[PDB]
Design a protein around this ligand. Structure first.
Ligand code: NA
Lengths: 216, 218, 225
């Protein structure tokens, strides 16, 4: 139902210790990246936000993170979900700490929100008060700055992004041009904390508006 | 049933009246693009043809047009369908006109055609007599030239494209290499309107022959 | 159930006897490529392996080979499956011979293997003892050299690739970064035949290990959160 939180779920977690040189090469790891933390989940944007949080909570970098084509509901296997993330660190301890922070964030109450009665339209409007090393790299903004992470289905996202950009003094840093692998769209916007918040609120309101009147 | 038209459906339409400068930047709009028209639908190629038709009826440009992975039947949300299109124009009135032309075309009787009994194989064989500014650009030909717009599932499309190219005096302008986002394939072919129609007819016949005999290669 | 072979199926096969120049150009064919063989199936990596077998059996090259987004289970049409392959040769006879070998290989008993009770996790751990021209070119090795062709879902594949690389004297030739179109991942590894077999064995064991315990981390390391 409308305004319900869609609960995100982690599906698998594993660790690689003393990563093989052949794999380190293909993943373009740094010399000091000895251990990898692997995670899959059924919600990509929540997991991306969680991985970024992990770079704050632990001595890890996000070295790989990709979404699956057509989304979790179309997964052909049990553990694929719609996202794979890989953290890299100097030791299993740091990688485990990163994965724990990732899990904590995923389970913290964050998630996509339903915009209609049968949850067939959903959106993500998450304000990140200070970016870690992953989302700042991705957005092309300074580490530690705030951002609004805004995602919705393609038309809703374009309409609502326009509403968000007019609601506050924010800049569009990275555009998730539709379709993402999961057939969504969105952007990372940056500005002051209060501006980003204002953008998240306007975005959510605008998605709900389209959902209530798709053909008007 | 074979030869049945598969009706295309529009799912969502909205107008942005005064696009924000930030959005205008990431969409790489031109300064004269003040208003956007957004549309999604459950059939990508019909929509692309419709959008191109809109550029003939109004002063709008197709500034964005993309298909969704795995097609409308696999959409995870209500309004995603399998295509999003964005028209840009100088005013909301002009964008509204372009959207109305787009909608009219989508509901004009064009569409994919079934090749078999349960409609599990379908194809698009549409002759565009006079391209607008969108398809001409993507095909790399002058505006106002004719196209055969040919789409089918991957093998059917490769086989039928060969038949189309042999049936008529046409050239391949743009190859939709399998898979497109929707797991189809095909091409835009150009030539005279009559040659394009002949290519459409041959493509159609060839897709149907594969559907009736999918494993036969001897 | 676990260790069950997943049977691959061919969906469509055709020959273009005399390819048009317009198509030859877009496919970037060689002048001597006069005929095309087309095939679709519901399992991409088995079909790729089969196409490579074709190049050992007849005068054909693999000139096109691509997987479908989100895999065969999400196909929206009857013949799309999850793969299209195109062979090119100098004549219809050679293409027919190539397609024949392709079909035979697909129906030989090769296939993905299930890792759990409901076959919701599967993998491919195929030792190609003698590569044809397609896989050897893909891997950047000489024809006839051995390959381990390893594929599994994304996390399983990353974990199991690391296991495979450590279990034998092999080199990573090609990495299929997750997601491939079908939302899998894997690699082609090369080495001696025995080394490739060891890699295949280690890969299979590692995937089954993840399948049986995908979230062991929670109890071991995530307690008191
Ligand atoms: Na599906």
């Amino acid at each position: 139902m409308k305004n319900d939180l869609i609960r995100p779920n982690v599906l698998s977690v594993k660790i690689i210790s003393n990563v093989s040189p052949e794999m380190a090469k293909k993943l373009e790891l740094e010399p000091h990246h000895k251990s990898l933390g692997l995670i899959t989940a059924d919600c990509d944007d929540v997991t991306y936000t969680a991985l970024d949080e992990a770079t704050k909570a632990a001595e890890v970098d996000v070295v790989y993170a990709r979404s699956m084509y057509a989304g979790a509901g179309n997964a052909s296997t049990k553990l694929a979900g719609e996202v794979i993330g890989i953290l890299a660190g100097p030791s299993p301890a740091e990688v485990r700490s990163g994965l724990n922070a990732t899990l904590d964030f995923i389970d913290s109450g964050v998630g996509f929100v339903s915009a209609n009665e049968d949850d067939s339209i959903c959106y993500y409007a998450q304000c990140v008060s200070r970016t870690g090393s992953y989302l700042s790299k991705t957005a092309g903004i300074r580490e530690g700055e705030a951002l609004a992470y805004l995602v919705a289905p393609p038309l809703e996202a374009m309409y609502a992004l326009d509403a968000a950009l007019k609601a506050a003094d924010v800049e569009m840093c990275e555009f998730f041009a539709p379709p993402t692998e999961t057939n969504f769209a969105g952007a990372l916007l940056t500005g002051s904390q209060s501006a980003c918040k204002a953008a998240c609120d306007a975005f959510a309101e605008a998605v709900q508006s389209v959902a209530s009147n798709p053909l008007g």
